[PDB]
Amino acid sequence: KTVDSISPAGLLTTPVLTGVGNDNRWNGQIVGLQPVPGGFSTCNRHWNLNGSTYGWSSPRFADIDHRRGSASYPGNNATNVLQFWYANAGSAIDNPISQVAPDGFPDMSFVPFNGPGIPAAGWVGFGAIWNSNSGAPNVTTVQAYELGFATGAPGNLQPTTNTSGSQTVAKSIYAVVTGTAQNPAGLFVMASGVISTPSANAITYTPQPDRIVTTPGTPAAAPVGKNTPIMFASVVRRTGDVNATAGSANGTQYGTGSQPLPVTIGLSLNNYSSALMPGQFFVWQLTFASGFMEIGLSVDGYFYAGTGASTTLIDLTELIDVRPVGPRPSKSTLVFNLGG
Amino acid sequence: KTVDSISPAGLLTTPVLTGVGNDNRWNGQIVGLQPVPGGFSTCNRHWNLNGSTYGWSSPRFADIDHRRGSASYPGNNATNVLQFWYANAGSAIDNPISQVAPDGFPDMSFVPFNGPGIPAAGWVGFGAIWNSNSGAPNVTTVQAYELGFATGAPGNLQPTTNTSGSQTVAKSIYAVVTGTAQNPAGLFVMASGVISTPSANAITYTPQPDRIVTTPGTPAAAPVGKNTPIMFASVVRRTGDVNATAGSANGTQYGTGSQPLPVTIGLSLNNYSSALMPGQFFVWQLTFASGFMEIGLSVDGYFYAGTGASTTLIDLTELIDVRPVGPRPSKSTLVFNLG
Numbered sequence: 001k002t003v004d005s006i007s008p009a010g011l012l013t014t015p016v017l018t019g020v021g022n023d024n025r026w027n028g029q030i031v032g033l034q035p036v037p038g039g040f041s042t043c044n045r046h047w048n049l050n051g052s053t054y055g056w057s058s059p060r061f062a063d064i065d066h067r068r069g070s071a072s073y074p075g076n077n078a079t080n081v082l083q084f085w086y087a088n089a090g091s092a093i094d095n096p097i098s099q100v101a102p103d104g105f106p107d108m109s110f111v112p113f114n115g116p117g118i119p120a121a122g123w124v125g126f127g128a129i130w131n132s133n134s135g136a137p138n139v140t141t142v143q144a145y146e147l148g149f150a151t152g153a154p155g156n157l158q159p160t161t162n163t164s165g166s167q168t169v170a171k172s173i174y175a176v177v178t179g180t181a182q183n184p185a186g187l188f189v190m191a192s193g194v195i196s197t198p199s200a201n202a203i204t205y206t207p208q209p210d211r212i213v214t215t216p217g218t219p220a221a222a223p224v225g226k227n228t229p230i231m232f233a234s235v236v237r238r239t240g241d242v243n244a245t246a247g248s249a250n251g252t253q254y255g256t257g258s259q260p261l262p263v264t265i266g267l268s269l270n271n272y273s274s275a276l277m278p279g280q281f282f283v284w285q286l287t288f289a290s291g292f293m294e295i296g297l298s299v300d301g302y303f304y305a306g307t308g309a310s311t312t313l314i315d316l317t318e319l320i321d322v323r324p325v326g327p328r329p330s331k332s333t334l335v336f337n338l339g340g
Numbered sequence: 341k342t343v344d345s346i347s348p349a350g351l352l353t354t355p356v357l358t359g360v361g362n363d364n365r366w367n368g369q370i371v372g373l374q375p376v377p378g379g380f381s382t383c384n385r386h387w388n389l390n391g392s393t394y395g396w397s398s399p400r401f402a403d404i405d406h407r408r409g410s411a412s413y414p415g416n417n418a419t420n421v422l423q424f425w426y427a428n429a430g431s432a433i434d435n436p437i438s439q440v441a442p443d444g445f446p447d448m449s450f451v452p453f454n455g456p457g458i459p460a461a462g463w464v465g466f467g468a469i470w471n472s473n474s475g476a477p478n479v480t481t482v483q484a485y486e487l488g489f490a491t492g493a494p495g496n497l498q499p500t501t502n503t504s505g506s507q508t509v510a511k512s513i514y515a516v517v518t519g520t521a522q523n524p525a526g527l528f529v530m531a532s533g534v535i536s537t538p539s540a541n542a543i544t545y546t547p548q549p550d551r552i553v554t555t556p557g558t559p560a561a562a563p564v565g566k567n568t569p570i571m572f573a574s575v576v577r578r579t580g581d582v583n584a585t586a587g588s589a590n591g592t593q594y595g596t597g598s599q600p601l602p603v604t605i606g607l608s609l610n611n612y613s614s615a616l617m618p619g620q621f622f623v624w625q626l627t628f629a630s631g632f633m634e635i636g637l638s639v640d641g642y643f644y645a646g647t648g649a650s651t652t653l654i655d656l657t658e659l660i661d662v663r664p665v666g667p668r669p670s671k672s673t674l675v676f677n678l679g
Contacts, residue, residue: 020400020605027401059360061401062367062532065582126466126482126530134589135582139514142466142483174479177517188582190466190530192401200476237403242470242477242528249474265360 008049008275008282008297009324011266017286018319023257024264025106027061027192028234031246032313033295034256035228035305039221040209042258044107048301049272054218056098056105059264061191064104064125064147066092067132069168069186072154073179081179083141085129085170085187086153089163100163100215104191107213109159110148110169117198121206122146124173124196124239127189131182140178144239145170145189146196149213163215195253197240202251205233205313219300224330227296227304231256233313254313259301267301280327283334289318290339296328306334314338345615348622348637349664351606357626357656363597365446365547367401367532368574370600371586372655373635375568375647379561380549382598384447388559389639390613395555396432396441399604404444404465404487404529406432407472409508412494413519421519423469423481425510425527426493429503440503440555444531447553449499450488450509457538458513461546462486464536464579467529471522480518484579485510485529486536489553503555513579533576535593540580545573545594559640566673567636567644571596573653594653599641607641620669629658630679636668646674654678 015021021030024045043055069087095103106123113119124146130137149160150169160166170187173196195206221229236255237244244252276282281296281304293314296304305314318339355361361370364385383395409427432442446463453459464486470477489500490509500506510527513536535546561569576595577584586592616622621636621644633654636644647654 015609019609029400060362060367060369063577067583128466130582136580137582142514144482174482186582188577190532192403192530192532237528240476241474242405243407243474269355269359 005275006270006272008272011263012260012284012322014321016260016262017316017322022261023232023234023255024259024261025257026234026236026255028236028255030232030234030260030316032233032254032315033230033305034205034233034313035230035307035310036209037223037228037309037311038209039223040212040229040231041214041218041220042212043215043218045261045264046258046301047264047267048219049267049276049299051268051271053097054215056095056101057103058097059261059268062104063191064102064127064187064189066102067094067135067186068184070183071129071180071185073181078179079177080175082172083129083143083176083179084154084172085185086167088167101168105168106147106193108148108207109161109211109213110146110150110157111159112157118173118239119146119196120198121203122196123148123193125189125193127187129180130186130188132184132186135186137188138178138180141176141180143172143174143176145172145187147189161213163213166213195236195238195255197238197253200241200250202253205254205256207256221302226308226333227306227330228308230303230305231258232260259303277327280329283325283328285323285325286319287321287323288339289320291337293336293338294334296334304334306336345610345612347615347666348607348612351603352624352662354662356600356602357662358659362601363572363574363595364599364601364604365533365597366574366576366595368576368595370572370574370656372573372594372653373570373645374545374573374594374596374653375570375645375650376549377563377568377649377651378549379563379569380552380571381554381558381560382447382552383555383558385604386598386641387604387607388641389616391608391611393437394558396435396438397444398437399601399608401531402444403531404442404467404527406442406526407434407524409525410523411469411520411525413521418519419517420515422512423485423516423519424494425469425525426490427508429506429508441508445508446487446533448488448547449501449551449553450490450497451499452497458536458579459486460538461535462488463533464513465529465533467527469520470526470528471520472524472526477528478518478520481516481520483512483514483516485512485527487529500553503553534578535576535595536579537593538580540578540590540593542591543593545596547596561640561642564644564670566646566648567670568647570635570643570645571598572600599643616667620667623665623668623674625663625665627660627663628679629660631677633676633678634665634674636674644674646676648676
């Protein structure tokens with residue numbers, strides 16, 4: 001009957017920002033929005049307004065499991081080494097969405113480090129290596145592993161930007177008493193991750209806009225007018241300091257994803273090809289305790305705020321309620337009557 | 341709309357059963373419902389019709405962290421041992437809900453084991469040890485640890501049924517070449533969990549109703565008439581076999597939880613004290629490809645189905661849509677028209 005479509009209004013409600021709500025990279029609670037000027041690209045769990053995506057990783061933090069790929073360890077002695085596993089891009093047969101990666105693989109560029117030094121930034125997760133042919137894993141290798149994308153493995157390792165021509169790498173950061181080198185081998189890494197750090201302090205918000213890998217054919221965020229794109233922050237645990245409660249003893253680490261997961265779940269099923277007229281964005285109205293803000297949502301899944309050329313984190317501590325408004329064009333500047 | 345709170349027909353819709361929507365113990369898709377004859381009692385992430393919880397563990401799979409608790413190891417040599425951590429039930433000062441357990445600690449009674457033989461079922465997790473006083477975690481000890489509740493540690497370790505008068509315990513299932521013995525020590529365990537199985541063929545759904553720990557003062561699910569309580573299964577990986585896929589090469593392990601997590605997320609905020617008159621349940625109508633089954637939701641937060649005295653797992657593969665019905669009393673028997 002009549003308009004047999006759904007407006008994109010009820011998926012982003014009041015308790016998505018001051019309560020429950022998680023990111024696309026870690027399953028961390030959203031405490032901030034931080035703008036970036038210049039743009040960024042994310043395509044992992046980023047769903048556009050149609051029923052499609054450009055990437056792997058169905059919206060769920062379950063598991064990373066890969067079966068075929070080569071393993072190695074350096075040194076002539078098979079005692080207290082760093083296990084290094086590699087596969088090429090396009091060998092993931094088990095993933096029904098995209099062949100370029102196993103489901104849940106982090107889309108960051110590998111940093112080249114060697115020796116006993118803990119690497120700065122990155123993506124580490126707890127996991128183990130398992131043999132093929134009705135797999136039972138080896139007992140004497142369970143460790144934290146840093147995964148990512150490289151070129152020229154296992155020799156001169158360089159970070160990669162584009163997924164085409166790249167190869168997925170997985171190097172342990174801690175010592176392990178056994179190292180295998182069998183050609184059929186795989187990984188089993190939990191989906192939720194932490195950030196590896198040399199000492200405490202606070203590196204930067206991770207990722208930076210330039211380190212994020214993109215597949216070919218990805219839509220990029222661009223600042224239109226005085227509006228600029230935002231990125232959702234979450235307080236995540238680190239390896240240099242396990243007790244990273246949001247209090248004293250330096251600023252806690254912030255990890256940033258692209259869009260809220262509730263939005264990814266509620267967008268995946270429905271088609272919104274006519275629900276928002278291109279050239280505009282759908283705008284919500286956040287009301288704090290001492291101000292208010294307008295937040296937009298385009299045809300590509302990106303979120304906009306009219307901060308301009310500022311890189312300051314905006315805290316949803318005093319946020320109370322949101323409210324739908326409708327479509328509004330991109331030439332109109334979203335308001336920035338904040339508490340300051 | 342400020343008073344006279346709404347009926348809960350919106351928290352359970354059609355994509356919960358055949359799409360997104362996870363469990364309470366594990367983060368997996370709900371592949372079926374299984375009826376337990378006799379009843380059960382889960383009080384970890386359980387919220388009633390009135391908004392209240394009787395227990396710890398806020399509804400989010402984050403991580404498990406503690407600061408106070410002692411670590412020890414057997415053997416005269418500090419090489420290839422099994423670490424042994426314990427703390428008493430009540431030292432969770434940082435927990436703002438209740439003191440009796442740290443946040444995210446599973447409600448599994450401890451299965452006592454000794455030696456290279458891995459235990460039968462349980463809750464293991466990839467984790468590490470860490471020391472207090474601005475201390476980072478130790479590099480050389482990261483392993484899979486099984487967690488639980490014991491009595492009489494570190495001597496004769498016994499499984500525990502009641503949460504009161506107990507102590508939380510954690511020990512490694514594999515070998516690690518180092519052990520620490522400081523009095524202040526703590527865990528860091530990922531919140532997602534798996535089940536350690538020795539031979540791993542068909543086995544048994546975990547946890548059983550005789551293995552779930554309970555806080556004192558819990559409400560207990562009872563079969564009223566022909567309606568039995570049900571409990572939602574999911575596919576969970578095992579330590580013996582990484583490929584725990586729903587296909588060929590052996591039947592799968594079904595990990596079971598009390599109520600779905602979108603239901604707990606939508607019901608941890610709203611209050612439904614006047615929405616449903618007690619003594620009845622809010623019944624829906626699931627429509628499969630060849631039949632229909634009615635599922636009721638009581639005031640305790642439990643789910644009821646009229647399957648009878650059967651332990652057959654009902655597969656949600658052909659389920660299409662869910663239409664709400666509303667309030668219906670406990671004397672009425674739910675239908676079980678199945679193909």
